[PDB]
Design a protein around this ligand. Structure first.
Ligand SMILES: [K+]
Ligand SMILES: [K+]
Ligand SMILES: [Mg+2]
Ligand SMILES: [Mg+2]
Ligand SMILES: [Mg+2]
Ligand SMILES: [Mg+2]
Ligand SMILES: [Mg+2]
Ligand SMILES: [Mg+2]
Ligand SMILES: [Mg+2]
Ligand SMILES: [Mg+2]
Ligand SMILES: [Mg+2]
Ligand SMILES: [Mg+2]
Ligand SMILES: [Mg+2]
Ligand SMILES: [Mg+2]
Ligand SMILES: [Mg+2]
Ligand SMILES: [Mg+2]
Ligand SMILES: [Mg+2]
Ligand SMILES: [Mg+2]
Ligand SMILES: [Mg+2]
Ligand SMILES: [Mg+2]
Ligand SMILES: [Mg+2]
Ligand SMILES: [Mg+2]
Ligand SMILES: [Mg+2]
Ligand SMILES: [Mg+2]
Ligand SMILES: [Mg+2]
Ligand SMILES: [Mg+2]
Ligand SMILES: [Mg+2]
Ligand SMILES: [Mg+2]
Ligand SMILES: [Mg+2]
Ligand SMILES: [Mg+2]
Ligand SMILES: [Mg+2]
Ligand SMILES: [Mg+2]
Ligand SMILES: [Mg+2]
Ligand SMILES: [Mg+2]
Ligand SMILES: [Mg+2]
Ligand SMILES: [Mg+2]
Ligand SMILES: [Mg+2]
Ligand SMILES: [Mg+2]
Ligand SMILES: [Mg+2]
Ligand SMILES: [Mg+2]
Ligand SMILES: [Mg+2]
Ligand SMILES: [Mg+2]
Ligand SMILES: [Mg+2]
Ligand SMILES: [Mg+2]
Ligand SMILES: [Mg+2]
Ligand SMILES: [Mg+2]
Ligand SMILES: [Mg+2]
Ligand SMILES: [Mg+2]
Ligand SMILES: [Mg+2]
Ligand SMILES: [Mg+2]
Ligand SMILES: [Mg+2]
Ligand SMILES: [Mg+2]
Ligand SMILES: [Mg+2]
Ligand SMILES: [Mg+2]
Ligand SMILES: [Mg+2]
Ligand SMILES: [Mg+2]
Ligand SMILES: [Mg+2]
Ligand SMILES: [Mg+2]
Ligand SMILES: [Mg+2]
Ligand SMILES: [Mg+2]
Ligand SMILES: [Mg+2]
Ligand SMILES: [Mg+2]
Ligand SMILES: [Mg+2]
Ligand SMILES: [Mg+2]
Ligand SMILES: [Mg+2]
Ligand SMILES: [Mg+2]
Ligand SMILES: [Mg+2]
Ligand SMILES: [Mg+2]
Ligand SMILES: [Mg+2]
Ligand SMILES: [Mg+2]
Ligand SMILES: [Mg+2]
Ligand SMILES: [Mg+2]
Ligand SMILES: [Mg+2]
Ligand SMILES: [Mg+2]
Ligand SMILES: [Mg+2]
Ligand SMILES: [Mg+2]
Ligand SMILES: [Mg+2]
Ligand SMILES: [Mg+2]
Ligand SMILES: [Mg+2]
Ligand SMILES: [Mg+2]
Ligand SMILES: [Mg+2]
Ligand SMILES: [Mg+2]
Ligand SMILES: [Mg+2]
Ligand SMILES: [Mg+2]
Ligand SMILES: [Mg+2]
Ligand SMILES: [Mg+2]
Ligand SMILES: [Mg+2]
Ligand SMILES: [Mg+2]
Ligand SMILES: [Mg+2]
Ligand SMILES: [Mg+2]
Ligand SMILES: [Mg+2]
Ligand SMILES: [Mg+2]
Ligand SMILES: [Mg+2]
Ligand SMILES: [Mg+2]
Ligand SMILES: [Mg+2]
Ligand SMILES: [Mg+2]
Ligand SMILES: [Mg+2]
Ligand SMILES: [Mg+2]
Ligand SMILES: [Mg+2]
Ligand SMILES: [Mg+2]
Ligand SMILES: [Mg+2]
Ligand SMILES: [Mg+2]
Ligand SMILES: [Mg+2]
Ligand SMILES: [Mg+2]
Ligand SMILES: [Mg+2]
Ligand SMILES: [Mg+2]
Ligand SMILES: [Mg+2]
Ligand SMILES: [Mg+2]
Ligand SMILES: [Mg+2]
Ligand SMILES: [Mg+2]
Ligand SMILES: [Mg+2]
Ligand SMILES: [Mg+2]
Ligand SMILES: [Mg+2]
Ligand SMILES: [Mg+2]
Ligand SMILES: [Mg+2]
Ligand SMILES: [Mg+2]
Ligand SMILES: [Mg+2]
Ligand SMILES: [Mg+2]
Ligand SMILES: [Mg+2]
Lengths: 102, 141, 109, 150, 55, 115
RNA sequence: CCCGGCGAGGGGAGUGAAAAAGAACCUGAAACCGUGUACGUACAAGCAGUGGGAGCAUGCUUAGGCGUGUGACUGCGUACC
RNA sequence: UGUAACGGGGCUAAACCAUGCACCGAAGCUGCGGCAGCGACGCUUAUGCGUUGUUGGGUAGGGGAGCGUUCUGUAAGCCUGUGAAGGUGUACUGUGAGGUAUGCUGGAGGUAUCAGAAGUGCGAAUGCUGACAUAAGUAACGAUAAAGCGGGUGAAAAGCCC
């Protein structure tokens, strides 16, 4: 049932139904996305690739949320050279629910 | 998606026997350490003792190349005022033939609690009889 | 009922009184009162008088019954220290602390 | 600060941090490094800037419709009760009643009223014109202020 | 002489582990009067092994 | 205008002592010591976001190298086998497949055996 | 009123809006010291954390998983001025 | 002080030579997301950007923009005994200094906004004052002239009284 696909400059081994967090997409809050970048599909018989991507495989997903992650603190500190720096960071994400491993 | 880690309670432990008779010390020891650490398993996790139990029988018959039967020395300090005790590879096998493999494996394991935990897995023996026939330890080469 | 009693400003340091109070903890009042009779310490007499008070305290005011009464919470807290000059050799002075303790006992069932 | 210029203890030998006075600001009780002094904060303002500013703020009262210009504005007798009753007709409460001929009857009936100030046409101010919600100016006062600002 | 750098709550506690003093848990009972006392010691009233031997 | 500074200082110390919560001894209790701990924690935290991406790659590589040698091929030849077959799949997932779906994984080792 | 030595001190009673406003009296921080719980800890070496991470305890929901508390093992890592 | 002149185990290749091909390997480069500086540029417009190029390690030091504290004006306004300031948690929230909301404690003050002024921010100065630790329940308890017992008083007696 499971399938592999490349999204936010990186790949996810996803099953049908389960939610997946991934890097922010230019999509609305409750629209839909099609990944034709599918790298692998597994079942009884595995449809692996001798080329880039499969052939007629498309992962259809529905966008759930559009949040920001946990705040990461960034402390740059140079011992004895009168230098330190502080910086927050909340990375943006997009939860997608998978609704079709073709 | 967080990756898999082998959870101790779920870890499958296998038993093995290795006959060291004529085998090269380092090349045996290495292949032992690889197994004892659990590197061969696809569920390898560095902070868990995934490796297998190994019985090394016929330790005394282990072979060494060149002049290392006489030349290879095993030093150790007694923790005393001037107590440095040495012992050649012959003298080592004459007295304690289990130590030869033990020391060669222990050096190749990691250092620390898990390193010591994965040494416990190893069971060296001077003779050919082993009293672990309960576990059905299968033959390894 | 819990029925507290406590000696505040008890002229004995915490560390010493707290040594006795570790004997009596989750013990029957009758068994605890005995111990302090045969504990050879100044804080035993100091801690007993609080417990023996906490029993009368418990029986008269609230709960009654001496048989079913255990020391549930005993504790010693460090009270105010009285500073004093203790003069030493070569002119130099030290500030010695006459320490006090707050002894509480809680006699429940 | 009161105290002596004695060294509390000598420079060496003691383990203490080398001190020179009981009055030093790093010591408790006495010091304050850069003590204050009485000082004239009255900063200088160019005549033309002051006039220009009045001319400016006095023109925004026309745009914003705060400036209620009127004919003769004077109360009957020195009584706050009356002045209070006559501002109720005009829908006024917070005001700066600027007048040419400063009359005792009016000036003495606006002391106790907190929301009513009665300046003379000569004694208008930058902050006052801005502060008050309306400005009820007398035709003579407009004529005096016109000639004053120019 | 003199510590290089101060010990902790922890160490101090570890040291005090053995300072905990033990109770008696071994009180006798006089045959006649039935009064509690230390073994091989007389009672408060003045008994030892069921016989008054003191005023 | 004299400015007392007890309200602010306390808030500033109390903030850092909240980040030092969990640390041994003075490192949780004592601002002067905590503040160092909280900085070094941040330095190490910044460092280890870099090291996390290294450690896991190693971890995966060692899983793949184990799982491939059960099928008779070493990691070095396997990745060249995959790259010469233009397979774009990463170490993260290969290591995930190696553990979970070995019957699937075997197909990649055959796919690599072609090249 | 009670315990204690007609003690100190305390528990009740009562006064008060309030008595952790009881004269050591508004608020009552921190260091420091305890008592109680949860988890860890008696074959393990080092700036004591940080990446990773099992288990146990937990509140929730719910038949999803979390959030916390702890932190066995493990990679890296010699405070600040 | 101890093997102590491969880091170690251990190796006749796990050594050297020569050739090849893989592969690992960094905060390098690439990918994806986000922020900022600077130049352009279509010429937008008074700047958001189809962008477009590119920078963005940093001590002394220069330049730019901010947060927060007490005080003055806006304020006889606004918020507050249906709970202020303060204290103590929690949860959100901004690149940061921070901010917001709120449970408990507290029991009367607080203050938006945009301005104005500073005793405007502390970890170090063998800084200053108070508190509190540590060593530690450790050394010590001040002449090595000496106590002992019986009775008395007393809550209690080695020390007080006879
Ligand atoms: K209070
Ligand atoms: K180390
Ligand atoms: Mg932050
Ligand atoms: Mg290492
Ligand atoms: Mg002396
Ligand atoms: Mg003297
Ligand atoms: Mg002189
Ligand atoms: Mg000193
Ligand atoms: Mg002064
Ligand atoms: Mg000036
Ligand atoms: Mg030192
Ligand atoms: Mg304890
Ligand atoms: Mg001791
Ligand atoms: Mg008897
Ligand atoms: Mg003031
Ligand atoms: Mg401040
Ligand atoms: Mg912890
Ligand atoms: Mg704390
Ligand atoms: Mg890497
Ligand atoms: Mg590749
Ligand atoms: Mg009575
Ligand atoms: Mg009485
Ligand atoms: Mg009495
Ligand atoms: Mg008396
Ligand atoms: Mg009486
Ligand atoms: Mg009385
Ligand atoms: Mg009393
Ligand atoms: Mg009462
Ligand atoms: Mg009452
Ligand atoms: Mg009442
Ligand atoms: Mg109240
Ligand atoms: Mg009270
Ligand atoms: Mg009451
Ligand atoms: Mg209170
Ligand atoms: Mg009094
Ligand atoms: Mg006090
Ligand atoms: Mg008090
Ligand atoms: Mg007072
Ligand atoms: Mg009051
Ligand atoms: Mg108070
Ligand atoms: Mg208090
Ligand atoms: Mg506190
Ligand atoms: Mg437990
Ligand atoms: Mg346990
Ligand atoms: Mg356990
Ligand atoms: Mg254990
Ligand atoms: Mg253990
Ligand atoms: Mg240690
Ligand atoms: Mg270590
Ligand atoms: Mg650690
Ligand atoms: Mg379980
Ligand atoms: Mg469980
Ligand atoms: Mg956690
Ligand atoms: Mg290190
Ligand atoms: Mg290291
Ligand atoms: Mg030597
Ligand atoms: Mg060496
Ligand atoms: Mg030499
Ligand atoms: Mg090397
Ligand atoms: Mg060597
Ligand atoms: Mg060979
Ligand atoms: Mg050469
Ligand atoms: Mg070479
Ligand atoms: Mg070559
Ligand atoms: Mg990298
Ligand atoms: Mg880069
Ligand atoms: Mg590029
Ligand atoms: Mg980019
Ligand atoms: Mg820079
Ligand atoms: Mg800003
Ligand atoms: Mg601003
Ligand atoms: Mg503010
Ligand atoms: Mg103000
Ligand atoms: Mg004011
Ligand atoms: Mg006023
Ligand atoms: Mg109002
Ligand atoms: Mg109001
Ligand atoms: Mg309410
Ligand atoms: Mg309200
Ligand atoms: Mg309200
Ligand atoms: Mg409230
Ligand atoms: Mg309320
Ligand atoms: Mg409140
Ligand atoms: Mg104020
Ligand atoms: Mg507030
Ligand atoms: Mg509380
Ligand atoms: Mg707390
Ligand atoms: Mg509020
Ligand atoms: Mg409320
Ligand atoms: Mg209240
Ligand atoms: Mg008042
Ligand atoms: Mg007031
Ligand atoms: Mg007010
Ligand atoms: Mg406020
Ligand atoms: Mg203001
Ligand atoms: Mg000025
Ligand atoms: Mg200052
Ligand atoms: Mg400083
Ligand atoms: Mg300070
Ligand atoms: Mg004081
Ligand atoms: Mg003692
Ligand atoms: Mg000692
Ligand atoms: Mg001694
Ligand atoms: Mg002594
Ligand atoms: Mg003596
Ligand atoms: Mg003496
Ligand atoms: Mg004597
Ligand atoms: Mg008598
Ligand atoms: Mg008597
Ligand atoms: Mg008497
Ligand atoms: Mg008598
Ligand atoms: Mg009497
Ligand atoms: Mg009597
Ligand atoms: Mg009596
Ligand atoms: Mg007597
Ligand atoms: Mg006598
Ligand atoms: Mg004597
Ligand atoms: Mg006599
Ligand atoms: Mg006489």
């Amino acid at each position: 049932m499971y399938a592999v696909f490349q999204s936010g400059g990186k790949q996810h081994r996803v099953s049908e139904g389960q939610t997946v967090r991934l890097e922010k997409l230019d999509i609305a809050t409750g629209e839909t996305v099609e990944f034709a970048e599918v790298l692998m599909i597994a079942n009884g018989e595995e449809v692996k690739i001798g080329v880039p991507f499969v052939d007629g495989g498309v992962i259809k997903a529905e966008v759930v949320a559009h949040g920001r992650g946990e705040k990461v603190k960034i402390v740059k500190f140079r011992r004895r050279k009168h230098y330190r720096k502080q910086q927050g960071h909340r990375q943006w994400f997009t939860d997608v629910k998978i609704t079709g491993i073709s | 998606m967080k990756t898999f880690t082998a959870k101790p309670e779920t870890v499958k432990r296998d038993w093995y026997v290795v006959d060291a008779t004529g085998k090269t010390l380092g090349r045996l020891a290495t292949e032992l350490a690889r197994r004892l650490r659990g590197k061969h398993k696809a569920e390898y996790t560095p902070h868990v003792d995934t490796g297998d139990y190994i019985i090394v029988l016929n330790a005394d018959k282990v072979a060494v190349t060149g002049n290392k039967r006489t030349d290879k020395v095993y030093y150790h300090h007694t923790g005393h005022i001037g107590g440095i005790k040495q012992a050649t590879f012959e003298e080592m096998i004459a007295r304690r033939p289990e130590r030869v493999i033990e020391i060669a494996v222990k050096g190749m394991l990691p250092k620390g609690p898990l390193g010591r935990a994965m040494f416990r897995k190893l069971k060296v023996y001077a003779g050919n009889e082993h009293n672990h026939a309960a576990q059905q330890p299968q033959v390894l080469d | 009922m819990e029925t507290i009693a406590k000696h505040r400003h008890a002229r004995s340091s915490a560390q010493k009184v707290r040594l006795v109070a570790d004997l009596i903890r989750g013990k029957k009042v009758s068994q605890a009162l005995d111990i302090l009779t045969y504990t050879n310490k100044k804080a035993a007499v100091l801690v007993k008088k609080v417990l023996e008070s906490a029993i009368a305290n418990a029986e008269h005011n609230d709960g009654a019954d001496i048989d079913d009464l255990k020391v549930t919470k005993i504790f010693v807290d460090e009270g105010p220290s009285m500073k004093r000059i203790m003069p030493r050799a070569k002119g130099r002075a030290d500030r010695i602390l006459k320490r006090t303790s707050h002894i509480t006992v809680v006699v429940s069932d | 600060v009161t105290g002596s210029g004695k060294k509390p203890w000598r420079q060496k030998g003691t383990g203490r941090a080398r001190s020179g006075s009981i009055k030093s600001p790093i010591w408790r009780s006495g010091g304050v490094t850069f003590a204050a002094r009485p000082q004239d904060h009255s900063q200088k303002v160019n005549k033309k800037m002051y006039r220009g500013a009045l001319k400016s703020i006095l023109s925004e009262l026309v745009r914003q419709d705060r400036l209620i210009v009127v004919e003769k504005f004077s109360v009957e007798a020195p009584k706050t009760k009356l002045l209070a009753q006559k501002l109720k007709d005009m829908a006024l409460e917070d005001v700066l009643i600027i007048t040419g001929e400063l009359d005792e009857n009016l000036f003495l009936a606006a002391r106790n009223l907190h929301k009513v100030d009665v300046r003379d046409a000569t004694g208008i101010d930058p902050v006052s014109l801005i502060a008050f919600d309306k400005v009820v100016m007398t035709a003579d006062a407009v004529k005096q202020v016109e000639e004053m600002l120019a | 002489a003199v510590q290089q750098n101060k010990p902790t709550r922890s160490k101090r506690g570890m040291r005090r582990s053995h300072d905990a003093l033990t109770a008696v848990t071994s009180l006798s009972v006089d045959k006649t009067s039935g009064e509690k006392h230390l073994r091989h010691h007389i009672t408060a009233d003045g008994y030892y092994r069921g016989r008054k031997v003191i005023a | 205008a004299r400015v007392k500074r007890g309200v602010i200082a306390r808030a500033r110390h109390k903030k850092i002592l909240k980040q030092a919560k969990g640390y041994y001894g003075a490192r949780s209790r004592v601002y002067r010591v905590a503040f160092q701990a909280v900085i070094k924690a941040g330095q190490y935290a910044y460092r280890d976001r870099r090291q996390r991406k290294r450690q896991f790659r190693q971890l995966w590589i060692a899983r793949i190298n184990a799982a491939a040698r059960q099928n008779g091929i070493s990691y070095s030849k396997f990745i060249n086998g995959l790259k010469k077959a233009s397979v774009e799949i990463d170490r993260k997932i290969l290591a995930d497949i190696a553990v979970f779906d070995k019957v699937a994984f075997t197909a990649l080792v055959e796919k690599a055996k072609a090249a």
